């Protein structure tokens with residue numbers, strides 16, 4: 395007997411990368427579902443007995459330790475930001491991807507503008523070079539797909555002053571991804587806000603866009619020194635690490651816990 | 659010569675609890691400002707040289723370790739939630755405090771509804787009792803004041819099944835606040851959503867509202883067992899720990915870093 399689309403979808407929710415099970419072997423849906431339900435209950439029970447840490451939270455903590463230990467200041471800045479930042483970032487009326495709140499605010503679609511303000515302010519007090527980073531939620535309206543979430547988690551690290559060269563940026567990216575065990579290559583790309591980017595690719599998956607300043611946008615943000623920076627999506631990092639087929643397994647969700655369905 | 663309101667406000671931005679300086683001693687504004695600017699630059703330089711951790715991030719990490727080590731599962735759930743959750747929580751049309759996003763979403767004003775969904779789902783897979791917690795951003799429109807932020811950080815821990823008594827709830831609260839070194843008392847209060855609460859007070863400052871279920875709301879969320887839970891604001895905890903006069907010193911902000919003005 396054949397499986398319906400609804401039945402296949404249910405089994406795909408319960409399947410995990412480490413399994414090797416044929417969904418269309420001819421084994422009935424009831425036995426495939428029962429087997430996968432038992433494997434997933436066992437997996438969740440083991441997490442609850444022995445680890446208890448959320449993958450996104452744990453990865454944020456691991457990344458925070460890496461950057462703090464390398465001299466970067468840990469920032470936590472507003473998620474709800476002025477809508478005026480959008481136009482001022484050169485997102486001309488991507489603009490359609492912004493979640494608006496009330497009439498003068500929005501959910502930040504990236505960390506960059508708040509970090510640019512911190513670089514400018516901290517350069518009045520701290521010695522050269524200024525090194526900061528932030529990890530937290532960002533928001534974009536997206537077409538459904540395997541590598542995009544509307545609510546995702548960004549890391550952005552950046553530096554301003556001395557040492558803001560392409561080679562130092564590539565070296566930090568290399569140390570960072572070597573620390574996480576993730577293979578990558580760097581390919582050129584370009585974007586509306588920053589211009590030319592160094593995109594960090596794991597196969598066809600974009601893990602990061604990175605930028606070597608200065609750029610013309612700097613003047614509108616009061617940035618007047620060389621700078622480098624890069625933005626990474628944490629759920630994309632987890633998708634690679636855990637071989638997830640869909641990024642939703644990695645997301646803030648009520649539907650998956652550490653990639654295990656919560657519909658059991 | 660006397661200080662203007664603008665001058666006093668500037669000195670108050672630069673003043674920290676550990677200082678003992680008379681603003682209206684007759685010393686001129688220029689010398690008070692220069693002295694406080696030097697103290698704050700020194701403070702920020704010491705943070706950058708020797709700690710580099712953000713107070714909110716560090717406190718989240720400390721609280722996470724406490725609860726994980728006591729058997730609670732770490733949750734990270736959506737911040738952008740369905741607007742339908744508001745009515746379903748008994749926030750009758752507090753309702754005016756909700757930030758709406760688009761037409762069917764809002765920013766969560768509390769963690770409770772997402773945690774109720776997790777308790778219900780996890781009770782199908784995990785052994786009794788179910789113990790979970792979450793730390794993250796919550797949002798409410800507020801009248802300006804010394805103890806409220808529009809963007810704040812909540813901890814909520816909760817348990818469902820056995821052990822869901824007032825005495826066990828009070829014992830967890832006591833262990834938690836003893837771990838942070840914060841004195842408190844418990845006073846009864848009541849709220850629209852949950853009914854009677856045990857409010858955890860540090861002087862006149864409400865650190866938490868806690869609840870012993872069951873309550874009538876349970877049926878609308880599929881909760882059908884005893885439960886306990888409590889919600890704490892992290893910025894209020896930091897206000898107590900650091901003796902800040904205004905909670906804004908503790909907030910996600912571009913204006914203060916670990917309670918030090920970034921306008922230097």
Ligand SMILES: Nc1ncnc2c1ncn2[C@@H]1O[C@H](COP(=O)(O)OP(=O)(O)OP(=O)(O)O)[C@@H](O)[C@H]1O
Nearest residue numbers: 534536541542543546600601602603625626627630
């Ligand atoms: N909607 C999203 N969901 C998950 N991660 C995202 C999303 N948008 C961006 N990111 C992550 O943030 C990083 C920095 O953002 P950037 O603006 O460069 O993304 P992007 O170039 O729009 O990505 P893409 O081309 O895949 O849409 C990306 O390299 C990616 O890892």
Ligand SMILES: Nc1ncnc2c1ncn2[C@@H]1O[C@H](COP(=O)(O)OP(=O)(O)OP(=O)(O)O)[C@@H](O)[C@H]1O
Nearest residue numbers: 798800805806807810864865866867889890891894
């Ligand atoms: N606007 C806010 N800013 C900062 N912390 C808050 C805010 N609202 C609530 N909290 C924190 O979250 C906890 C749980 O939320 P709860 O709904 O009980 O607050 P509340 O009773 O409305 O607080 P209050 O009476 O002070 O407005 C509070 O005890 C407090 O520590």
Ligand SMILES: [N-]=[N+]=Nc1cccc(COC(=O)NCCCC[C@H](N)C(=O)O)c1
Nearest residue numbers: 504506509510552603605617621623625
């Ligand atoms: N705007 N502006 N001017 C500045 C000036 C100086 C530094 C910063 C710091 O922030 C950054 O690091 N920018 C690089 C981020 C690259 C990732 C990004 N999400 C992207 O959409 O490609 C901003």
Ligand SMILES: [N-]=[N+]=Nc1cccc(COC(=O)NCCCC[C@H](N)C(=O)O)c1
Nearest residue numbers: 768770773774816867869881885887889
């Ligand atoms: N809704 N509903 N039903 C349930 C049923 C079971 C458990 C939960 C779990 O969530 C909770 O812990 N509730 C207690 C939170 C108290 C703090 C809160 N911010 C307040 O406004 O007073 C919710």
Ligand SMILES: [K+]
Nearest residue numbers: 410411412413
């Ligand atoms: K598989």
Ligand SMILES: [K+]
Nearest residue numbers: 674675676677
């Ligand atoms: K003082």
Ligand SMILES: [Mg+2]
Nearest residue numbers: 491534536542
């Ligand atoms: Mg994109």
Ligand SMILES: [Mg+2]
Nearest residue numbers: 583593600603
């Ligand atoms: Mg791209």
Ligand SMILES: [Mg+2]
Nearest residue numbers: 585600602603
């Ligand atoms: Mg990109």
Ligand SMILES: [Mg+2]
Nearest residue numbers: 755798800806
């Ligand atoms: Mg209130």
Ligand SMILES: [Mg+2]
Nearest residue numbers: 847857864867
């Ligand atoms: Mg109250």
Ligand SMILES: [Mg+2]
Nearest residue numbers: 849864866867
């Ligand atoms: Mg309360």
